[PDB]
Design an enzyme around this catalytic site. Sequence first.
Site, PDB file in Angstrom:
ATOM      1  N   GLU A  99      83.603 -47.695  40.714  1.00  0.00           N
ATOM      2  CA  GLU A  99      82.956 -48.956  40.338  1.00  0.00           C
ATOM      3  C   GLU A  99      81.910 -48.709  39.242  1.00  0.00           C
ATOM      4  OE1 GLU A  99      83.092 -52.240  41.223  1.00  0.00           O
ATOM      5  OE2 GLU A  99      84.173 -52.374  43.139  1.00  0.00           O
ATOM      6  N   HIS A 146      91.883 -52.302  37.852  1.00  0.00           N
ATOM      7  CA  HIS A 146      92.071 -53.023  39.108  1.00  0.00           C
ATOM      8  C   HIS A 146      93.116 -54.117  38.871  1.00  0.00           C
ATOM      9  CE1 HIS A 146      90.204 -55.219  42.880  1.00  0.00           C
ATOM     10  NE2 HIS A 146      91.463 -54.860  43.060  1.00  0.00           N
TER      11      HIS A 146
END
Length: 256
Positions: A99, A146
Amino acid sequence: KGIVEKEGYQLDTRRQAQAAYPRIKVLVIHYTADDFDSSLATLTDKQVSSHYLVPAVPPRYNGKPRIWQLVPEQELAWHAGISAWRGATRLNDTSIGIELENRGWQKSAGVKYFAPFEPAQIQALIPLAKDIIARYHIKPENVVAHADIAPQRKDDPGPLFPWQQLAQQGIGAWPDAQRVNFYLAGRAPHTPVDTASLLELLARYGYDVKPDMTPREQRRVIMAFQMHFRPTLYNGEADAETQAIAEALLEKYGQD
Ligand SMILES: [Cl-]
Ligand SMILES: [Zn+2]
Ligand SMILES: [Zn+2]
């Protein structure tokens, strides 16, 4: 001599199989859409998690950028959700999630604008990405967005994420310009091209492509790919250049 005493039995580990391989095959990239402290609290709640969190501009110590680890690699994190890549589903199982602190997009006078990634964030990301790939023998076509694996649901990391700069460093897939050029076959880059042909190419590269999808669903799939591979225009319409690029990627890296 590899004899381990266990409770109720013992184990002979002197013979070792050649057919042994990592359970980690894919590295996945995200943005947080939030400040560091909110991100951190969120990635440590009971709904979601990730393996690494990189600040927008990492603080330095010993002359070294500090990155946060929240889940040990040998265990899965809840980051990917419902996903599909190159014939696999349930991508939490077989992936590592990084992240990055980034704003994502916002409507700014009704115009969906994205937020750029700081040099200092990438500079830190490079060494880590390189270690993880080396450790698990991850293949470049398996360094993904993602959005690449959840095309109907996610945008991250978006078109301003520098995929190409990273390829120059042995991080993730990217075609040979010569071969793209070849596959254009001297059509003008934006020349319309058969939509279904492009989906077939995209499915085989790794994109989740179902039979009988709605025109909106078809666009999301193409749109996802364009954000990664052709970020100057990502309206989800099929054209000579977009196809040339997929053609060149399947040539260099194949179907797995
Ligand atoms: Cl400290
Ligand atoms: Zn994400
Ligand atoms: Zn701390």
